[PDB]
Amino acid sequence: LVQCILDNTIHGRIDQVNQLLELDHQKRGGARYTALDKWTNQLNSLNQAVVSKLA
Amino acid sequence: NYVVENPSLDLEQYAASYSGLMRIERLQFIADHCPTLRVEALKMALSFVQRTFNVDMYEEIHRKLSEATRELQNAPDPPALDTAWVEATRKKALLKLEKLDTDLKNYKGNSIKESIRRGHDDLGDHYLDCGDLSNALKCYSRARDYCTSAKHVINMCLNVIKVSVYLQNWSHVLSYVSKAESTPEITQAILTKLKCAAGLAELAARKYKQAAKCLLLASFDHCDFPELLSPSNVAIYGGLCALATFDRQELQRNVISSSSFKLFLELEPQVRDIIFKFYESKYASCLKMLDEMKDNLLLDMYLAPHVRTLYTQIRNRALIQYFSPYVSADMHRMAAAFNTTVAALEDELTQLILEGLISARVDSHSKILYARDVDQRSTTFEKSLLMGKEFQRRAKAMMLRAAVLRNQIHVK
Amino acid sequence: EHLIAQHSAIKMLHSRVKLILEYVKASEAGEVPFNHEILREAYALCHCLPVLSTDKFKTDFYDQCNDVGLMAYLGTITKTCNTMNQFVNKFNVLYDRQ
Amino acid sequence: LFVKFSMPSVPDFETLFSQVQLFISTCNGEHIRYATDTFAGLCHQLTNALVERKQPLRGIGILKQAIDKMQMNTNQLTSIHADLCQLCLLAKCFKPALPYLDVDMMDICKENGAYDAKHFLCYYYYGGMIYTGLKNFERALYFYEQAITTPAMAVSHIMLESYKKYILVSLILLGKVQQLPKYTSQIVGRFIKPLSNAYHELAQVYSTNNPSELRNLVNKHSETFTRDNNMGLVKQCLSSLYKKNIQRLTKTFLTLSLQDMASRVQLSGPQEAEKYVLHMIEDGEIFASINQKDGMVSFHDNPEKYNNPAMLHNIDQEMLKCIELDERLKAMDQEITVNPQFVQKSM
């Protein structure tokens, strides 16, 4: 299981304490909010730097 | 720092594997950094130093050997340099050197570029034999002018690379490696030697990601490369740098695809086991061997300072890779995945969380490491609100700045 | 035209509702005393007027509302920073040099 | 009356104060805005007399009326504000100031050319101290930052102490010295960094994150920070470092015992750690729980899922603030469009 996860074949994780293999469901439909947040932060820092340099 | 007290070094093999000034410097490094074995290292060093007309470094090595022998004469309660060597060496060295200087000045009066270049290379080699670093450079740095063929340029680059290693002018090595590679249209494997030159130069320059990439491209067909670095150390150098920088997928692809590092791993089975144990998640066996090889390469010429950072990076990467497949891993089992104690791992894990790239939380109650899987949306909203607050504050700041500039308010 | 579109849709729905209500009022006085299918189905249909929800639907509705509100806030920030950039460009002109 | 105050013939101050109160109460200053220089000097002399007699409690109310009468809008900053904040600081009565300091006022009255930037510098320093006293470190840091960025061709003590207070508040709030902006200032910046070395030295050890070492440095430079009229800020810096270490433990620990928490933070015992966690939770800084049965403290993430109407209402309040800011920006852009030079360049 560890080898399969490390090979990106398994989109999940292992709970060794309880002998459990917790697999992510991927039903969140995310990975877009991450891009939106990166865009927001990068361009807002960009605007702040531009304003500081121009003023 | 370094200069530790470690036994079990094989002096005969390490001395014989290298040859030239490269051997002399390594033997000096081994003696100076490995006590309880410095005498035989110095005795073997001075035995090889007197060969090929050494003058200044001989006095330093002989003085160190004299001090070392004097130390042995007081513990279980100094050799003569045979100054006749000075009389013999100097008279012989000067006569041939002036004769070589004699022949070259004829070729300067005969005006042949290749002959001038070839003679200065011989003069540079003789100066390196005589123990004259800068003198060899100027011969090489004026032979560079009189180049005619691409092979002459390649020989010019190799000579400058060799000297700048001794001079520790690694910038000149990298510049000449780039010149020797990019210019001539990127059985005689010449690029392999150049890639080996870049790999060691980058490693001596505290560079790891490019050094491993260059070392992995080095083909084993080069075989005898003793003027710069032995193949045994090249495999060790490549494996350690690859382990610290290359990820699991990056490790597997590069090692297998190269097909020369597989041969390099065969020369050094210890580092081969490390990567295999790194791949198969057996970091307990991976790191215990790592400490075993540590003491050996802790007295390596261009490894001793760098490898401590490399080994520290190895430990960090191993911990990151180990906990990555687990959402909830017992710290006892993670502690049992090495010879470390529970408290020491907890401190190491806490440091890793503070630095980052582990994304975990420590539940010290039951000592279980729970992975952090924070939803992207909550953090996104929090930092967006923080960004909006900062933007409003900066808007107020620029509003005040505009007001004070329009009202001409300033201290006179 | 956006609100007018929903306004016309709501007018159509209200016209249907008023037709149903007028039919019921007429049946109360005259017409067929019990139209059977029609009346029973209209009762069951008002039973769906309070579509009614649970915690999960309200949570998801508030989630979508918060996401669109954050996007609106980002757009307002972009417009405000563009206005600030224009103001700073003019401010570097009227009095400031270089 | 201004002529009287400009002369040393000032009579019984009790009758003089009553006449001032009668004038202010029945004030019809529809044209006092023209003679702003005379009124500003009147307030300065009145404030100087109040400081001399050490009775700054009553001057707050009178100066509050003075600002209201002469100012045009609520977003105008005058020289009377500097004296008003000084009286509040000396009287230790920060209640009236906060209403008038929470208004962000970008219209500096030239006082018919008599407005010296010292009043601007004094107002932000005194205002920051008032916010510092009310534990409003964010606004105090903002006021100190604005005072730092004032363009000045000379170095002044009021500016120097404003910079020193800026470092102290930055250490308390953010745990580090916030970098000065790039719209910047003048030689004020150049000289003061050579000047306030000890405060920078305190920040350097603060960056090392060692309360024991920090306390040793504080004792070494105890007299240097005594030239501050406040030593409590250094103690507040130490408490903030203790709080920051606790906060850093939350990001790394899910459940930590009191004994281990005391050892890591270098506390005298588990009881102090429990009190510190309890105080920080009361202030709303930590989301955690304490288990006295097993001697464990369980840390937790932010319980805010941003699915409640409160976050939406806060976002809409920020919407209103940003919309008002953009309207003010557009008004300023129009006013700049009105000016002669831009039109001359355009034509």
CSV table of C-alpha atoms in Angstrom, one decimal, chain B:
chain,number,residue,atom,x,y,z
B,1,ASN,CA,33.3,21.1,12.6
B,2,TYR,CA,35.1,18.0,11.2
B,3,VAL,CA,38.6,16.6,12.1
B,4,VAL,CA,36.9,13.7,14.0
B,5,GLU,CA,38.5,10.5,15.4
B,6,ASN,CA,37.4,7.6,13.1
B,7,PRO,CA,39.2,4.2,12.4
B,8,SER,CA,39.0,1.8,9.5
B,9,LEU,CA,40.1,4.0,6.6
B,10,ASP,CA,42.0,2.1,3.9
B,11,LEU,CA,44.9,4.4,3.1
B,12,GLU,CA,46.5,2.2,0.4
B,13,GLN,CA,43.4,2.1,-1.8
B,14,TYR,CA,42.5,5.7,-1.4
B,15,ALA,CA,46.0,6.9,-2.2
B,16,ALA,CA,46.5,4.6,-5.2
B,17,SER,CA,43.1,5.4,-6.7
B,18,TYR,CA,44.1,9.1,-7.2
B,19,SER,CA,47.3,10.3,-8.8
B,20,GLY,CA,49.1,13.6,-9.1
B,21,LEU,CA,48.6,16.8,-7.1
B,22,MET,CA,45.1,15.5,-6.6
B,23,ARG,CA,46.5,12.6,-4.6
B,24,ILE,CA,48.9,14.9,-2.7
B,25,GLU,CA,46.1,17.2,-1.5
B,26,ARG,CA,43.8,14.3,-0.5
B,27,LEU,CA,46.6,12.6,1.5
B,28,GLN,CA,47.3,15.9,3.2
B,29,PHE,CA,43.6,16.2,4.0
B,30,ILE,CA,43.4,12.7,5.3
B,31,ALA,CA,46.4,13.2,7.6
B,32,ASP,CA,45.3,16.6,8.9
B,33,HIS,CA,41.7,15.4,9.6
B,34,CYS,CA,42.3,11.8,10.8
B,35,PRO,CA,44.4,11.6,14.0
B,36,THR,CA,45.7,8.2,15.3
B,37,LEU,CA,46.4,7.6,11.6
B,38,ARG,CA,48.2,10.8,10.6
B,39,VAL,CA,51.7,9.4,10.9
B,40,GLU,CA,51.3,6.6,8.2
B,41,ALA,CA,49.2,9.1,6.2
B,42,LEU,CA,52.0,11.6,6.5
B,43,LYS,CA,54.7,9.0,6.0
B,44,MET,CA,53.0,7.8,2.8
B,45,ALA,CA,52.4,11.5,1.8
B,46,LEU,CA,56.1,12.5,2.1
B,47,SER,CA,57.1,9.3,0.4
B,48,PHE,CA,55.1,10.4,-2.7
B,49,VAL,CA,55.7,14.1,-2.3
B,50,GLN,CA,59.4,13.8,-2.8
B,51,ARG,CA,58.6,12.3,-6.2
B,52,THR,CA,58.2,14.9,-9.0
B,53,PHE,CA,60.2,17.9,-7.5
B,54,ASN,CA,58.1,19.4,-4.8
B,55,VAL,CA,59.6,22.4,-3.0
B,56,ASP,CA,57.3,24.4,-0.8
B,57,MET,CA,54.6,21.9,0.1
B,58,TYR,CA,57.4,19.4,0.9
B,59,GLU,CA,58.7,21.7,3.7
B,60,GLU,CA,55.2,21.9,5.1
B,61,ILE,CA,54.6,18.2,4.9
B,62,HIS,CA,58.1,17.3,6.3
B,63,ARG,CA,57.6,19.7,9.2
B,64,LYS,CA,54.2,18.1,10.0
B,65,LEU,CA,55.8,14.6,9.8
B,66,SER,CA,58.6,15.7,12.0
B,67,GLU,CA,56.1,17.0,14.6
B,68,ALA,CA,54.0,13.8,14.2
B,69,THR,CA,57.1,11.6,14.8
B,70,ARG,CA,58.1,13.7,17.8
B,71,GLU,CA,54.6,13.2,19.2
B,72,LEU,CA,55.0,9.4,18.9
B,73,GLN,CA,58.3,9.6,20.8
B,74,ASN,CA,56.5,10.8,24.0
B,75,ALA,CA,53.2,8.9,24.1
B,76,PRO,CA,54.4,5.3,24.6
B,77,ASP,CA,57.0,6.5,27.1
B,78,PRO,CA,61.5,13.5,13.9
B,79,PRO,CA,62.7,12.2,10.5
B,80,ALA,CA,65.5,14.0,8.6
B,81,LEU,CA,64.5,15.6,5.3
B,82,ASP,CA,67.9,14.6,3.9
B,83,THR,CA,68.7,18.2,2.7
B,84,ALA,CA,70.9,16.5,0.1
B,85,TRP,CA,67.5,16.2,-1.7
B,86,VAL,CA,67.3,20.0,-1.9
B,87,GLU,CA,70.7,20.1,-3.5
B,88,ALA,CA,69.8,17.2,-5.9
B,89,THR,CA,66.2,18.4,-6.6
B,90,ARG,CA,66.9,22.1,-7.2
B,91,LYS,CA,69.9,21.5,-9.5
B,92,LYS,CA,68.0,18.9,-11.6
B,93,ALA,CA,64.8,20.9,-11.6
B,94,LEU,CA,66.5,24.2,-12.8
B,95,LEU,CA,68.6,22.5,-15.5
B,96,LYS,CA,65.7,20.9,-17.3
B,97,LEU,CA,63.4,23.8,-16.7
B,98,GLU,CA,65.8,26.3,-18.3
B,99,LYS,CA,66.3,23.8,-21.1
B,100,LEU,CA,62.6,23.6,-21.6
B,101,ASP,CA,62.5,27.4,-21.4
B,102,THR,CA,65.3,27.3,-23.9
B,103,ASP,CA,63.4,25.3,-26.4
B,104,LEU,CA,60.2,27.3,-26.2
B,105,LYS,CA,61.8,30.6,-26.7
B,106,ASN,CA,63.2,29.2,-29.9
B,107,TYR,CA,59.6,28.5,-31.0
B,108,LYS,CA,58.6,32.0,-30.1
B,109,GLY,CA,61.2,33.2,-32.5
B,110,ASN,CA,60.0,30.6,-35.0
B,111,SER,CA,56.3,31.8,-34.6
B,112,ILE,CA,54.3,28.6,-34.7
B,113,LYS,CA,51.0,28.9,-32.7
B,114,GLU,CA,50.5,25.1,-32.0
B,115,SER,CA,54.2,24.7,-31.0
B,116,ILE,CA,53.9,27.7,-28.7
B,117,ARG,CA,50.7,26.3,-27.2
B,118,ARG,CA,52.2,22.8,-26.8
B,119,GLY,CA,55.4,24.1,-25.2
B,120,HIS,CA,53.5,26.3,-22.7
B,121,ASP,CA,51.3,23.3,-21.8
B,122,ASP,CA,54.6,21.4,-21.1
B,123,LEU,CA,55.8,24.3,-19.1
B,124,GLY,CA,52.6,24.4,-17.2
B,125,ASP,CA,52.8,20.7,-16.5
B,126,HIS,CA,56.5,21.1,-15.4
B,127,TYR,CA,55.5,24.0,-13.1
B,128,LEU,CA,52.8,21.9,-11.6
B,129,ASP,CA,55.3,19.1,-11.2
B,130,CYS,CA,57.7,21.7,-9.7
B,131,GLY,CA,55.0,22.9,-7.4
B,132,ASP,CA,54.2,26.3,-9.1
B,133,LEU,CA,50.4,26.9,-9.3
B,134,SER,CA,50.3,30.4,-10.6
B,135,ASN,CA,53.4,29.8,-12.9
B,136,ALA,CA,51.6,26.9,-14.5
B,137,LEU,CA,48.5,29.1,-15.0
B,138,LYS,CA,50.3,31.8,-16.9
B,139,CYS,CA,51.8,29.2,-19.2
B,140,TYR,CA,48.3,27.8,-19.7
B,141,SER,CA,46.8,31.3,-19.8
B,142,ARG,CA,49.1,32.2,-22.7
B,143,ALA,CA,48.8,28.8,-24.4
B,144,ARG,CA,45.0,29.5,-24.6
B,145,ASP,CA,45.8,32.4,-27.0
B,146,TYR,CA,47.6,30.2,-29.6
B,147,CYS,CA,44.8,27.7,-30.3
B,148,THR,CA,44.1,26.5,-33.8
B,149,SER,CA,41.9,23.3,-33.6
B,150,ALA,CA,38.9,22.3,-31.6
B,151,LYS,CA,40.9,19.5,-29.9
B,152,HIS,CA,43.4,22.2,-28.9
B,153,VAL,CA,40.5,24.2,-27.3
B,154,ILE,CA,39.4,21.0,-25.5
B,155,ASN,CA,42.9,20.4,-24.2
B,156,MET,CA,43.1,24.1,-23.2
B,157,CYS,CA,39.8,23.8,-21.2
B,158,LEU,CA,40.9,20.6,-19.5
B,159,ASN,CA,44.2,22.1,-18.3
B,160,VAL,CA,42.5,25.2,-17.0
B,161,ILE,CA,39.9,23.1,-15.2
B,162,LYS,CA,42.6,20.9,-13.6
B,163,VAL,CA,44.6,23.9,-12.3
B,164,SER,CA,41.6,25.9,-11.1
B,165,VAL,CA,40.6,22.9,-8.9
B,166,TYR,CA,43.9,23.2,-7.1
B,167,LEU,CA,43.6,27.0,-7.0
B,168,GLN,CA,40.0,26.5,-5.9
B,169,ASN,CA,39.0,28.9,-8.7
B,170,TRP,CA,35.9,26.9,-9.4
B,171,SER,CA,34.4,29.8,-11.4
B,172,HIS,CA,37.2,29.3,-14.0
B,173,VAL,CA,36.4,25.6,-14.1
B,174,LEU,CA,32.7,26.2,-14.7
B,175,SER,CA,33.4,28.8,-17.4
B,176,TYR,CA,35.7,26.5,-19.2
B,177,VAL,CA,33.3,23.5,-18.9
B,178,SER,CA,30.6,25.7,-20.5
B,179,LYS,CA,33.1,26.8,-23.2
B,180,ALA,CA,34.2,23.2,-23.9
B,181,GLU,CA,30.6,21.9,-24.0
B,182,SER,CA,28.5,24.5,-25.8
B,183,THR,CA,31.0,25.4,-28.5
B,184,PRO,CA,31.7,22.1,-30.4
B,185,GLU,CA,28.3,20.9,-31.6
B,186,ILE,CA,26.7,19.8,-28.3
B,187,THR,CA,34.3,6.2,-29.1
B,188,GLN,CA,36.2,9.1,-27.6
B,189,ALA,CA,33.9,10.2,-24.7
B,190,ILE,CA,35.1,13.7,-24.2
B,191,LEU,CA,31.9,15.2,-22.8
B,192,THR,CA,31.9,12.6,-20.0
B,193,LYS,CA,35.1,14.1,-18.6
B,194,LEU,CA,33.7,17.6,-18.8
B,195,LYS,CA,30.5,16.6,-17.0
B,196,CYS,CA,32.6,15.0,-14.3
B,197,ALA,CA,34.5,18.3,-14.0
B,198,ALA,CA,31.3,20.3,-13.6
B,199,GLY,CA,29.8,17.9,-11.1
B,200,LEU,CA,32.7,18.1,-8.6
B,201,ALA,CA,33.1,21.8,-9.1
B,202,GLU,CA,29.4,22.4,-8.4
B,203,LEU,CA,29.5,20.2,-5.4
B,204,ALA,CA,32.6,22.1,-4.1
B,205,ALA,CA,30.5,25.3,-4.7
B,206,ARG,CA,27.8,24.1,-2.3
B,207,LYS,CA,25.5,23.2,-5.2
B,208,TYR,CA,23.6,19.9,-5.0
B,209,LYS,CA,20.7,19.7,-7.6
B,210,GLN,CA,22.9,20.5,-10.6
B,211,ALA,CA,25.9,18.5,-9.3
B,212,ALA,CA,23.8,15.3,-9.0
B,213,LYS,CA,22.3,16.0,-12.5
B,214,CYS,CA,25.7,16.4,-14.0
B,215,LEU,CA,27.2,13.4,-12.1
B,216,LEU,CA,24.3,11.1,-13.2
B,217,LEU,CA,25.1,12.0,-16.9
B,218,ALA,CA,28.7,10.8,-16.4
B,219,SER,CA,29.2,7.5,-18.3
B,220,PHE,CA,31.3,4.7,-16.7
B,221,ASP,CA,33.2,4.3,-19.9
B,222,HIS,CA,35.4,7.2,-18.7
B,223,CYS,CA,36.9,4.7,-16.2
B,224,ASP,CA,40.3,6.1,-15.4
B,225,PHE,CA,39.8,9.7,-14.3
B,226,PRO,CA,42.3,10.1,-11.4
B,227,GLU,CA,43.5,13.7,-11.9
B,228,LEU,CA,40.2,15.0,-10.5
B,229,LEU,CA,38.1,12.4,-8.7
B,230,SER,CA,38.1,8.6,-8.4
B,231,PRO,CA,35.0,6.7,-9.7
B,232,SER,CA,34.4,5.3,-6.2
B,233,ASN,CA,33.9,8.8,-4.8
B,234,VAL,CA,32.0,9.9,-7.9
B,235,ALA,CA,29.4,7.2,-7.2
B,236,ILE,CA,29.3,8.2,-3.5
B,237,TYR,CA,29.0,11.9,-4.5
B,238,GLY,CA,26.3,11.2,-7.0
B,239,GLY,CA,24.2,9.0,-4.7
B,240,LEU,CA,24.3,11.4,-1.7
B,241,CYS,CA,23.3,14.5,-3.8
B,242,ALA,CA,20.6,12.6,-5.7
B,243,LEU,CA,19.1,11.4,-2.3
B,244,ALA,CA,19.0,14.9,-0.9
B,245,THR,CA,17.6,16.6,-3.9
B,246,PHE,CA,15.9,14.1,-6.2
B,247,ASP,CA,12.4,13.0,-5.1
B,248,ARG,CA,11.3,9.4,-5.3
B,249,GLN,CA,10.0,9.5,-8.9
B,250,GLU,CA,13.0,11.7,-9.8
B,251,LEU,CA,15.3,9.3,-8.1
B,252,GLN,CA,14.0,6.2,-9.8
B,253,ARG,CA,13.9,7.7,-13.3
B,254,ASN,CA,17.3,9.2,-13.3
B,255,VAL,CA,19.2,6.3,-11.8
B,256,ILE,CA,17.6,3.7,-14.1
B,257,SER,CA,17.7,5.8,-17.3
B,258,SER,CA,21.3,6.8,-16.9
B,259,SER,CA,22.5,3.1,-16.9
B,260,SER,CA,25.9,4.3,-15.9
B,261,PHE,CA,24.9,5.1,-12.3
B,262,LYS,CA,23.7,1.5,-12.1
B,263,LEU,CA,27.3,0.6,-12.7
B,264,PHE,CA,28.3,3.3,-10.2
B,265,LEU,CA,26.0,1.8,-7.7
B,266,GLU,CA,27.7,-1.6,-8.3
B,267,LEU,CA,31.1,-0.1,-7.3
B,268,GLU,CA,29.5,1.2,-4.1
B,269,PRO,CA,26.9,-1.3,-2.9
B,270,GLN,CA,26.3,0.7,0.3
B,271,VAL,CA,24.8,3.8,-1.4
B,272,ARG,CA,22.9,1.5,-3.7
B,273,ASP,CA,21.2,-0.1,-0.7
B,274,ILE,CA,20.4,3.5,0.6
B,275,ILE,CA,18.4,4.5,-2.5
B,276,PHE,CA,16.6,1.1,-2.6
B,277,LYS,CA,15.8,1.4,1.1
B,278,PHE,CA,14.8,5.0,0.5
B,279,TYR,CA,12.4,3.8,-2.3
B,280,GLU,CA,10.9,0.9,-0.4
B,281,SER,CA,10.2,3.0,2.8
B,282,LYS,CA,12.8,1.3,5.1
B,283,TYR,CA,14.3,4.6,6.4
B,284,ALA,CA,15.3,2.8,9.6
B,285,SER,CA,17.8,0.7,7.7
B,286,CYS,CA,18.5,3.6,5.3
B,287,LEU,CA,19.7,6.0,8.0
B,288,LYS,CA,21.6,3.6,10.2
B,289,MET,CA,23.8,2.8,7.2
B,290,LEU,CA,24.0,6.5,6.5
B,291,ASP,CA,25.8,7.1,9.8
B,292,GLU,CA,28.1,4.2,9.0
B,293,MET,CA,29.3,5.8,5.8
B,294,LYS,CA,29.2,9.3,7.5
B,295,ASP,CA,32.4,8.8,9.5
B,296,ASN,CA,34.2,7.5,6.4
B,297,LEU,CA,33.4,10.5,4.1
B,298,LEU,CA,33.7,13.0,7.1
B,299,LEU,CA,37.4,13.1,6.2
B,300,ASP,CA,36.8,13.5,2.4
B,301,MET,CA,38.5,16.5,0.7
B,302,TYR,CA,35.5,18.3,-0.9
B,303,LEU,CA,32.7,16.5,1.0
B,304,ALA,CA,33.3,17.0,4.8
B,305,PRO,CA,31.5,20.4,5.1
B,306,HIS,CA,28.9,19.9,2.3
B,307,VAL,CA,27.8,16.4,3.3
B,308,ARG,CA,26.7,17.5,6.8
B,309,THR,CA,24.1,19.7,5.0
B,310,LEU,CA,23.5,16.9,2.6
B,311,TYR,CA,22.9,14.3,5.4
B,312,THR,CA,20.7,16.8,7.2
B,313,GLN,CA,18.6,17.2,4.1
B,314,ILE,CA,18.5,13.4,3.7
B,315,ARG,CA,17.0,13.0,7.2
B,316,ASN,CA,14.4,15.8,6.5
B,317,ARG,CA,13.4,14.3,3.1
B,318,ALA,CA,13.2,10.8,4.6
B,319,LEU,CA,10.8,12.0,7.3
B,320,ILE,CA,8.7,13.9,4.8
B,321,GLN,CA,8.5,10.8,2.5
B,322,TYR,CA,7.7,8.5,5.4
B,323,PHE,CA,4.7,10.4,6.8
B,324,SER,CA,3.4,11.4,3.4
B,325,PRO,CA,1.3,8.2,2.8
B,326,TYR,CA,-0.2,8.4,6.3
B,327,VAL,CA,-3.1,10.6,7.4
B,328,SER,CA,-2.8,9.4,11.0
B,329,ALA,CA,0.5,7.7,11.9
B,330,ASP,CA,1.6,6.7,15.4
B,331,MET,CA,4.7,8.5,16.5
B,332,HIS,CA,5.8,5.4,18.4
B,333,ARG,CA,5.9,3.5,15.0
B,334,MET,CA,7.6,6.5,13.4
B,335,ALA,CA,10.1,6.6,16.3
B,336,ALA,CA,10.5,2.8,15.8
B,337,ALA,CA,11.2,3.5,12.2
B,338,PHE,CA,14.7,4.6,13.3
B,339,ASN,CA,17.1,4.3,16.2
B,340,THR,CA,15.9,7.7,17.5
B,341,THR,CA,14.0,8.1,20.8
B,342,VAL,CA,10.4,9.2,21.1
B,343,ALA,CA,11.4,12.6,22.4
B,344,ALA,CA,14.1,13.2,19.8
B,345,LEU,CA,11.7,12.4,16.9
B,346,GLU,CA,9.1,14.7,18.4
B,347,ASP,CA,11.6,17.5,18.5
B,348,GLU,CA,12.7,16.7,14.9
B,349,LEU,CA,9.0,16.6,13.8
B,350,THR,CA,8.2,19.8,15.6
B,351,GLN,CA,11.2,21.5,13.8
B,352,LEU,CA,9.9,20.1,10.5
B,353,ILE,CA,6.4,21.5,11.1
B,354,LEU,CA,7.9,24.9,12.0
B,355,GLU,CA,10.0,24.9,8.8
B,356,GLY,CA,7.2,23.3,6.8
B,357,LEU,CA,6.7,20.7,4.0
B,358,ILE,CA,5.3,18.1,6.4
B,359,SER,CA,1.8,19.6,6.9
B,360,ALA,CA,1.3,17.7,10.2
B,361,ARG,CA,0.1,18.1,13.8
B,362,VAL,CA,1.6,16.4,16.8
B,363,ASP,CA,-0.9,14.8,19.3
B,364,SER,CA,1.5,14.3,22.2
B,365,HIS,CA,-1.3,12.8,24.3
B,366,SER,CA,-1.2,9.4,22.6
B,367,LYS,CA,2.0,10.4,20.7
B,368,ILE,CA,0.3,10.1,17.2
B,369,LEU,CA,1.2,12.2,14.3
B,370,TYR,CA,-2.0,13.3,12.6
B,371,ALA,CA,-1.6,14.8,9.1
B,372,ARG,CA,-3.0,18.2,8.4
B,373,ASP,CA,-5.5,18.2,5.6
B,374,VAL,CA,-7.0,21.7,6.0
B,375,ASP,CA,-9.6,22.6,3.4
B,376,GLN,CA,-8.4,25.1,0.8
B,377,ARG,CA,-11.5,27.2,1.1
B,378,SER,CA,-11.2,28.2,4.8
B,379,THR,CA,-7.5,29.2,4.5
B,380,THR,CA,-8.4,31.0,1.2
B,381,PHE,CA,-11.2,33.0,2.9
B,382,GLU,CA,-9.0,33.8,5.9
B,383,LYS,CA,-6.1,35.1,3.8
B,384,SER,CA,-8.5,36.9,1.5
B,385,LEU,CA,-9.9,38.8,4.4
B,386,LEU,CA,-6.4,39.6,5.7
B,387,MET,CA,-5.5,40.8,2.2
B,388,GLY,CA,-8.6,43.0,2.1
B,389,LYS,CA,-7.8,44.5,5.5
B,390,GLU,CA,-4.2,45.2,4.4
B,391,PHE,CA,-5.5,46.7,1.2
B,392,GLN,CA,-7.8,49.0,3.2
B,393,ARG,CA,-4.9,50.0,5.5
B,394,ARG,CA,-2.7,50.8,2.5
B,395,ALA,CA,-5.5,52.7,0.9
B,396,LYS,CA,-5.8,54.8,4.0
B,397,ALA,CA,-2.0,55.3,4.0
B,398,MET,CA,-1.9,56.5,0.4
B,399,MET,CA,-5.0,58.7,1.1
B,400,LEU,CA,-3.1,60.4,3.9
B,401,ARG,CA,0.0,60.7,1.8
B,402,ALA,CA,-2.0,62.4,-1.0
B,403,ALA,CA,-3.6,64.7,1.6
B,404,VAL,CA,-0.2,65.7,3.1
B,405,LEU,CA,1.4,66.2,-0.3
B,406,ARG,CA,-1.5,68.3,-1.6
B,407,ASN,CA,-1.5,70.4,1.5
B,408,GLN,CA,2.3,70.8,1.4
B,409,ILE,CA,2.8,69.5,5.0
B,410,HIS,CA,6.4,68.8,5.8
B,411,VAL,CA,9.0,69.7,8.5
B,412,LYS,CA,11.1,72.6,7.4
